Structures are given as structure tokens and as C-alpha cells.
Amino acid sequence: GQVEVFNGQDTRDGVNILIMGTDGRIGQNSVETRTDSIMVLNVGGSDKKMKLVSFMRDNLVYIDGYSQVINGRKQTDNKLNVAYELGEQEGQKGAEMVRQVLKDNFDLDIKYYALVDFQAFATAIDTLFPDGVTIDAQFSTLNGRPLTEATVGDDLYAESPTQTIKVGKQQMNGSTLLNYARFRDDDEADYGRTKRQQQVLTAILEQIKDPTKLFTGSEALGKVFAMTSTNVPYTFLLTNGLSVLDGAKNGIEKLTIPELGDWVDAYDVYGGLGLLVDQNKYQTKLAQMGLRAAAL
């Protein structure tokens, strides 16, 4: 929610930005919110390519202060999506808590954050995109069978409607696009959701028209800002903005951590089921992608 502490750190190549979707509505935030999306976007690296990494919410992670230590062994015994909630409960430390965790588990240094709730997102998209966003809607299988449409809970309308998205290229308004990003009810589960979220983010950046005019000054862009929580400096947007919007047209190198299937099921300390992952291996991949650029 709106105010967030952040002790951003610099990375050796580019700038890492933590990006999170929360489930609240414009004006509630904090202890009534959950994380639906956790991404790190690297911009301005030497290779001139943007990188986007989704962390699956069920990632089991060591949360300092809250996780056990058996012998000397730190336990990855909490789900990652918990870290935000623990921080909102501590007091405006949700983004910060995610940052500390990603640092401790994946050795990522992250400089800035941006947070959106669902309602903001939907409104924001209607504001920016009067003809909606072009998306090529795609789903995985269900028990091996290909899907050609998906039923999603239409959560922005409370007393419990749903919505059906057919596969293929179409225009999506904010509500649709949010719903599309939230869908997880196929063989790929949260992993496939990460790919849709990545797809949506990419699409937004690619389809912004008149990119300069935003910065010069736009009431639309302002309305959006009002509905967002971010510590990204405005001069950073002025100096790096068009490069990001253009770099998005060239396409973004994407990764989900962990990759599909590349995990073992295990219980968190609360008796929930999470993903135990080989963090070292993913630290090496992050280095290879230029998000921490270490060791070799």
C-alpha cells in the first residue's frame, strides 16, 4: 500500500526494480492486502537488453527473524508471498521485506520498487488505453487437453461473477486484462500465471503511444501515478523511460524462478505446501542474465 520504506541497493549491471501486484482496491492497503505477483525488472544493463524475472509466490525462502535455524542451517520454511504481509504488519515494510528476502535467498540487489493493487491496475489501463490492450490470450493444457478458453473469477465485481476469456489476439480492457493475468487454473498453475503477468507487462510497455508526451505532462499518467506506490525518481524516468519503452518492443528476456517442474514440494512452518528450490543454481542463472553478475 501507498507508503513503503525501501533501502534500495545498486547492482553491477543495469538497475533492478522490484514490481508487485497486490490484491487490495484503491484505498485499503497494508494488512488487508496480499501479493499476487512478484517480479524483478533489470533495465540499462551494458548488453542493452531488458530482463524480467518472476518469482513464484510459493517459493520457500529464509525470512530472517521469522524462519527457523536448525544447527547452523537456515531453513527456507516460509512462502515468499508471506514476506510482504509480514512487512505490512511491521508497518509500511512490505516492499522492503520482499527486498531483504530476495537479497538473502537469491543475492539480488534491488534499487527501486513499484506496487499496484488490482483496482488501480484496471482503472489505470482504462485511462491509458481507451481501446484496451492487444493481447494474444494463451493457456496451457488441463490434464493434457488443450484449452481454448478460461473461466476467471471477476473479482472486481462483488456477489461473485466470473468471466470467460477465449484464446487468441484480442483487445482487453483493464478488468479483462487483470483477470487474464490472474488466471492459474490449468496444468501450469502459478508458473503459467507468471508467464501471463510477464506478457501483460511487456504488452503495456510496447503499446504505449506518444511516449514523450507522458513525461512532458499528461493528466492520464498523473491519475495512474496517484494509484501507484513507487520510489522510482522522476529524473530516472526522464533519462531511462523511452529506452525502456523501446527496449520492450525488441522484447524482454524472461525467466520464472523456479522453472516449470524444477522444484520439490515441501511444507512451510504453517503446514502449507511450497516449492523447495535450488537457490544456488538460480543465483548462477541470475548472474548469467546480468541481474547480479557475480563469481563466474
The contact set with a copy of itself (CB under 8 A) reads: 1-2, 12, 24, 26-29, 70, 73, 75, 77, 85, 88-89, 91-92, 117, 126, 130-132, 140-141, 143-146, 148, 159, 171, 173, 187-188, 192, 255-256, 259-262, 264-267, 269, 271, 273, 276, 285, 294-296
How far apart are CB 79 and a copy of itself at their closest, in Å? Answer: 13
Residue closer to a copy of itself (CB basis): 70 or 216: 70
Query: Are 290 and 279 spatial neighbours (Cβ–Cβ below 8 Å)?
Result: no
How far apart are CB 138 and a copy of itself at their closest, in Å? Answer: 9
How far apart are CB 153 and a copy of itself at their closest, in Å? Answer: 16
How far apart are CB 266 and a copy of itself at their closest, in Å? Answer: 5
Residue closer to a copy of itself (CB basis): 36 or 85: 85
Residue closer to a copy of itself (CB basis): 174 or 241: 174
Residue closer to a copy of itself (CB basis): 87 or 241: 87
Residue closer to a copy of itself (CB basis): 247 or 258: 258
How far apart are CB 117 and a copy of itself at their closest, in Å? Answer: 8
Residue closer to a copy of itself (CB basis): 3 or 235: 3
How far apart are CB 242 and a copy of itself at their closest, in Å? Answer: 26
Contacts for 20 with CB less than 8 Å, ≥ 6 apart: 35, 37, 38, 39, 84, 95, 98, 113, 114, 115, 116
Residue closer to a copy of itself (CB basis): 1 or 247: 1
How far apart are CB 247 and a copy of itself at their closest, in Å? Answer: 20
